[PDB]
Amino acid sequence: GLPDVASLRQQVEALQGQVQHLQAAFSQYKKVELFPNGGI
Amino acid sequence: GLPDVASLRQQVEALQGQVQHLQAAFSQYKKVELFPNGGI
Amino acid sequence: GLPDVASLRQQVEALQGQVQHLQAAFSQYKKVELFPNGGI
Protein backbone atom coordinates (compact mmCIF):
# COMPACT_ATOMS: atom_id res chain seq x y z
CA GLY A 1 0.00 0.00 0.00
CA LEU A 2 0.91 3.70 0.02
CA PRO A 3 2.25 3.79 3.65
CA ASP A 4 4.55 0.84 2.85
CA VAL A 5 5.86 2.75 -0.16
CA ALA A 6 7.17 5.51 2.11
CA SER A 7 8.10 2.82 4.65
CA LEU A 8 10.56 1.44 2.14
CA ARG A 9 12.17 4.86 2.30
CA GLN A 10 12.89 4.47 6.01
CA GLN A 11 14.14 0.96 5.26
CA VAL A 12 16.40 2.64 2.75
CA GLU A 13 17.65 4.99 5.48
CA ALA A 14 18.35 1.82 7.40
CA LEU A 15 20.45 0.51 4.55
CA GLN A 16 22.50 3.70 4.57
CA GLY A 17 22.76 3.39 8.33
CA GLN A 18 24.46 0.05 7.86
CA VAL A 19 26.93 1.36 5.32
CA GLN A 20 27.72 4.44 7.39
CA HIS A 21 28.52 2.47 10.55
CA LEU A 22 30.43 -0.02 8.47
CA GLN A 23 32.53 2.83 7.16
CA ALA A 24 32.72 3.85 10.81
CA ALA A 25 34.26 0.59 11.94
CA PHE A 26 36.15 0.47 8.65
CA SER A 27 37.98 3.68 9.63
CA GLN A 28 39.89 1.62 12.19
CA TYR A 29 40.44 -1.34 9.85
CA LYS A 30 41.31 1.20 7.15
CA LYS A 31 44.64 1.96 8.78
CA VAL A 32 45.19 -1.74 9.43
CA GLU A 33 46.99 -2.55 6.18
CA LEU A 34 50.10 -0.49 5.98
CA PHE A 35 52.33 -2.35 8.43
CA PRO A 36 51.32 -6.06 7.87
CA ASN A 37 53.48 -9.12 8.49
CA GLY A 38 56.04 -10.42 6.04
CA GLY A 39 59.27 -12.30 5.57
CA ILE A 40 60.20 -15.57 7.24
CA GLY B 1 8.04 2.28 -17.08
CA LEU B 2 6.06 0.79 -14.20
CA PRO B 3 7.82 -2.64 -14.20
CA ASP B 4 11.20 -0.88 -14.00
CA VAL B 5 9.98 1.08 -11.00
CA ALA B 6 9.47 -2.13 -9.02
CA SER B 7 12.61 -3.51 -10.68
CA LEU B 8 14.57 -0.78 -8.95
CA ARG B 9 13.32 -2.32 -5.71
CA GLN B 10 14.96 -5.65 -6.52
CA GLN B 11 18.04 -3.66 -7.43
CA VAL B 12 17.85 -2.10 -3.96
CA GLU B 13 17.63 -5.59 -2.49
CA ALA B 14 20.82 -6.21 -4.43
CA LEU B 15 22.41 -3.19 -2.82
CA GLN B 16 21.52 -4.53 0.62
CA GLY B 17 22.86 -7.89 -0.46
CA GLN B 18 26.23 -6.27 -1.05
CA VAL B 19 26.29 -4.56 2.31
CA GLN B 20 25.15 -7.69 4.14
CA HIS B 21 27.88 -9.89 2.66
CA LEU B 22 30.35 -7.09 3.19
CA GLN B 23 29.42 -7.09 6.86
CA ALA B 24 29.76 -10.87 6.55
CA ALA B 25 33.36 -10.75 5.43
CA PHE B 26 33.87 -7.78 7.75
CA SER B 27 33.05 -10.02 10.71
CA GLN B 28 36.44 -11.66 10.16
CA TYR B 29 38.29 -8.41 9.49
CA LYS B 30 36.39 -6.90 12.41
CA LYS B 31 38.44 -8.91 14.90
CA VAL B 32 41.60 -8.13 12.94
CA GLU B 33 42.53 -4.91 14.73
CA LEU B 34 43.07 -5.69 18.34
CA PHE B 35 46.51 -7.33 18.22
CA PRO B 36 48.30 -5.34 15.39
CA ASN B 37 52.03 -4.85 15.00
CA GLY B 38 54.03 -2.24 16.85
CA GLY B 39 57.38 -1.26 18.28
CA ILE B 40 60.74 -1.55 16.56
CA GLY C 1 7.52 16.79 -4.86
CA LEU C 2 7.96 14.76 -8.05
CA PRO C 3 11.56 15.98 -8.80
CA ASP C 4 12.62 14.96 -5.27
CA VAL C 5 11.16 11.51 -5.86
CA ALA C 6 13.59 10.91 -8.73
CA SER C 7 16.23 12.81 -6.73
CA LEU C 8 16.04 10.07 -4.12
CA ARG C 9 17.08 7.76 -6.94
CA GLN C 10 20.35 9.62 -7.45
CA GLN C 11 20.79 9.62 -3.67
CA VAL C 12 20.32 5.88 -3.94
CA GLU C 13 23.08 5.77 -6.57
CA ALA C 14 25.14 7.62 -4.00
CA LEU C 15 24.46 4.91 -1.47
CA GLN C 16 25.68 2.28 -3.92
CA GLY C 17 28.67 4.49 -4.63
CA GLN C 18 29.61 4.25 -0.97
CA VAL C 19 29.29 0.48 -0.84
CA GLN C 20 31.22 0.03 -4.09
CA HIS C 21 34.21 2.10 -2.95
CA LEU C 22 34.01 0.43 0.42
CA GLN C 23 34.30 -2.91 -1.32
CA ALA C 24 37.11 -1.24 -3.25
CA ALA C 25 39.13 -0.43 -0.17
CA PHE C 26 37.94 -3.69 1.35
CA SER C 27 39.72 -5.57 -1.44
CA GLN C 28 43.00 -4.61 0.22
CA TYR C 29 41.77 -5.31 3.76
CA LYS C 30 40.21 -8.49 2.37
CA LYS C 31 43.61 -10.13 2.06
CA VAL C 32 44.61 -8.77 5.45
CA GLU C 33 43.41 -11.69 7.54
CA LEU C 34 45.25 -14.77 6.47
CA PHE C 35 48.64 -14.18 8.08
CA PRO C 36 47.72 -12.40 11.42
CA ASN C 37 49.76 -12.43 14.62
CA GLY C 38 49.70 -15.22 17.15
CA GLY C 39 51.58 -17.08 19.84
CA ILE C 40 53.60 -15.50 22.63
Side-chain angles (χ1 to χ4, degrees):
Chain A
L2 298 177
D4 183 60
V5 172
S7 299
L8 166 60
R9 287 32 178 185
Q10 34 163 300
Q11 182 186 300
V12 132
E13 298 174 293
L15 181 54
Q16 61 176 301
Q18 303 278 166
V19 70
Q20 70 179 287
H21 82 292
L22 251 55
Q23 211 291 88
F26 218 172
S27 189
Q28 299 285 165
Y29 309 117
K30 183 179 304 173
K31 44 91 184 189
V32 159
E33 187 185 64
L34 58 216
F35 61 5
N37 298 305
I40 173 181
Chain B
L2 297 177
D4 180 66
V5 173
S7 300
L8 167 60
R9 289 32 180 181
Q10 35 164 301
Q11 183 187 300
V12 306
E13 296 176 297
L15 180 55
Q16 61 177 302
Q18 303 277 168
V19 72
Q20 69 179 289
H21 82 291
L22 250 56
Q23 210 292 87
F26 221 169
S27 190
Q28 300 284 169
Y29 309 116
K30 172 185 311 171
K31 43 91 184 188
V32 158
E33 188 185 63
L34 58 217
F35 61 4
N37 298 306
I40 173 182
Chain C
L2 298 177
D4 184 61
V5 172
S7 300
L8 166 61
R9 286 32 177 182
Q10 35 163 300
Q11 181 186 299
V12 132
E13 298 176 295
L15 181 54
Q16 61 178 302
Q18 302 278 165
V19 70
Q20 69 180 289
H21 82 292
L22 250 55
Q23 211 292 89
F26 217 172
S27 191
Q28 299 286 164
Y29 309 116
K30 183 179 304 173
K31 44 91 184 188
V32 159
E33 188 183 63
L34 59 216
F35 61 4
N37 299 306
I40 173 181

